[PDB]
Scaffold this active site. Structure first.
Site, PDB file in Angstrom:
ATOM      1  N   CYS A   1     -30.757  50.272  -5.137  1.00 44.18           N
ATOM      2  CA  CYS A   1     -31.543  51.894  -5.712  1.00 44.18           C
ATOM      3  C   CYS A   1     -32.730  51.671  -5.394  1.00 44.18           C
ATOM      4  CB  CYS A   1     -31.349  51.459  -7.463  1.00 44.18           C
ATOM      5  SG  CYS A   1     -29.619  51.841  -8.138  1.00 44.18           S
TER       6      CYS A   1
ATOM      7  N   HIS B   1     -30.750  45.288  -6.912  1.00 46.45           N
ATOM      8  CA  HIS B   1     -31.454  46.417  -7.650  1.00 46.45           C
ATOM      9  C   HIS B   1     -32.934  46.419  -6.727  1.00 46.45           C
ATOM     10  CE1 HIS B   1     -28.658  46.845 -10.839  1.00 46.45           C
ATOM     11  NE2 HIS B   1     -29.751  45.363 -11.665  1.00 46.45           N
ATOM     12  N   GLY B   2     -33.243  47.593  -7.103  1.00 50.09           N
ATOM     13  CA  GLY B   2     -34.505  47.876  -6.227  1.00 50.09           C
ATOM     14  C   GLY B   2     -35.061  49.160  -6.716  1.00 50.09           C
TER      15      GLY B   2
ATOM     16  N   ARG C   1     -29.169  45.297 -15.355  1.00 50.97           N
ATOM     17  CA  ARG C   1     -27.992  44.761 -15.625  1.00 50.97           C
ATOM     18  C   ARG C   1     -27.685  44.065 -14.660  1.00 50.97           C
ATOM     19  NH1 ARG C   1     -23.932  49.775 -18.018  1.00 50.97           N
ATOM     20  NH2 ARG C   1     -23.472  49.545 -20.285  1.00 50.97           N
TER      21      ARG C   1
END
EC number: 3.4.22.61
Lengths: 88, 153, 88, 153
Positions: free
Chosen positions: D139, D96-97, D37
């Site tokens: 994340c 994000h990650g 997302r």
């Protein structure tokens, strides 16, 4: 009754950053541990929080030298403590 | 007046001290470690930890030259224990090591993560919400921390 | 002039421990950042060392809950500082 | 009393803010990310960061929707600057990650270590001896943290 993350309230006292070595003088112990203690017995009575101490250990250790291969040692504490951790 | 971890308990808690010195075991089995020397000097570390932590009202629990296996067994014990009247738990490991792992006296590998994770909340409710300290004194690779000049401090 | 290790004076503030998710509310932002700033605001003036502020953030975030997947989020600082770090 | 990092400087130092939001590239490229997302809400993170660090006399340097390459390009800039008059350096990343990595706005990935290791004492001596702070907000896996009960605090 409250909830907290499974991994909370931890504290790792690494003696060295990854990929590198640690120093131990066979005549008085390891830089890290020795400093850890010295700082521990010193600051603790003054009521200093552990992070504070560990920070100082970071200092003390930083000023040591291994002239032979012009080396250094960098301790690195990681943590999940949720409150000050003092040892009265 | 920030929140503080409680530390009043008669014997604050246990202070495991896994101290490995004799690595003849290792040398003898794992090839690539043919030359790992004995950690001459650990004893002094061990003592210092013993002294200072005792003075902080902690119950010491030493163990020498523990193979990887032994280490797990040991932690497993303190893992299943009931630290209900304990306010904290400290675990010190002095041994050889490498990237993210310490060495048993047998040359076996123990990921630091594997160790520390033994004491989560699910894995040890008696310690939920209580400080769990780990002091590892090993190597994390074979590099040398190059130093740089400055003179600030 | 003197010498200190290559990796000295670093401070990593991970919003979560490994292999785990970190939360972001499209409404107010993320649990970690929002909580980090909030605290920085209320604490820096006082004089609180960054480790201290970072600890509290570990706290505040720990009390948050993802009721649905009955999950949590645990931030995790890692540091190499050698001196207290305050922001006057 | 104890030693403290000098924080007198006029701008104090730069405060990078790499703020990733539109992840349509990743979606297109990387297969396994077909459904990541967009990071709604970051704007707010960037704002809050901006203000709070502005008020702390830092010179914000925002950047938006950066591919992994752009991120490196950017760090290489501040990595090459003369922070001689600077007292500190802060770099924030919102994206994000996964296990030990951050995600470029294109799906490409960058180890936290790579970014971090860019401003060492050797790599950027104009910063040696000064605090280098990083705030990674992403994340680090797909496991929802557990969470156990206990009324302490």
């Amino acid at each position: 009754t409250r909830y907290i993350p499974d991994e909370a309230d931890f504290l790792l006292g690494m003696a060295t950053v990854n990929n590198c070595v640690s120093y131990r003088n066979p005549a008085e112990g390891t830089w890290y541990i020795q400093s850890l203690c010295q700082s521990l017995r010193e600051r603790c009575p003054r009521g200093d929080d552990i992070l504070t101490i560990l920070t100082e250990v970071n200092y003390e250790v930083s000023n040591k030298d291994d002239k032979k291969n012009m080396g250094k040692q960098m301790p690195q504490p990681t943590f999940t403590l949720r409150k000050k951790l003092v040892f009265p | 007046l920030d929140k503080v971890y409680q530390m009043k308990s008669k014997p604050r808690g246990y202070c495991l001290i896994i101290n490995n010195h004799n690595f003849a075991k290792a040398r003898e089995k794992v090839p690539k470690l043919h030359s790992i020397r004995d950690r001459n000097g650990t004893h002094l570390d061990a003592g210092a930890l013993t002294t200072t932590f005792e003075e902080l009202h902690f119950e010491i629990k030493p163990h020498h030259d523990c193979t990887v296996e032994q280490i797990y067994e040991i932690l497993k014990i303190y893992q299943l224990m009931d630290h209900s009247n304990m306010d904290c738990f400290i675990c010190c490991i002095l041994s050889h090591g490498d990237k993210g792992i310490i060495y048993g006296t047998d040359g076996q590998e123990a990921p630091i993560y594997e160790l520390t994770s033994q004491f989560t909340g699910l894995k040890c409710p008696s310690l939920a919400g209580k400080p769990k300290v780990f002091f590892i004194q090993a190597c994390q690779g074979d590099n040398y921390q190059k130093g740089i000049p400055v003179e600030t401090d």
